[PDB]
Amino acid sequence: AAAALAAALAQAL
Numbered sequence: 912a913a914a915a916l917a918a919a920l921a922q923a924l
């Protein structure tokens with residue numbers, strides 16, 4: 912889950 916989210920945020924920004 913950590914990675915999923917990490918990646919989400921990365922993309923968002």
Ligand SMILES: *c1ccc([N+](=O)[O-])c2nonc12
Pocket residue numbers: 914915917918919921
């Ligand atoms: C999660 C998984 C892979 C990568 N990546 O840089 O290839 C990520 N970057 O930020 N979160 C992830």
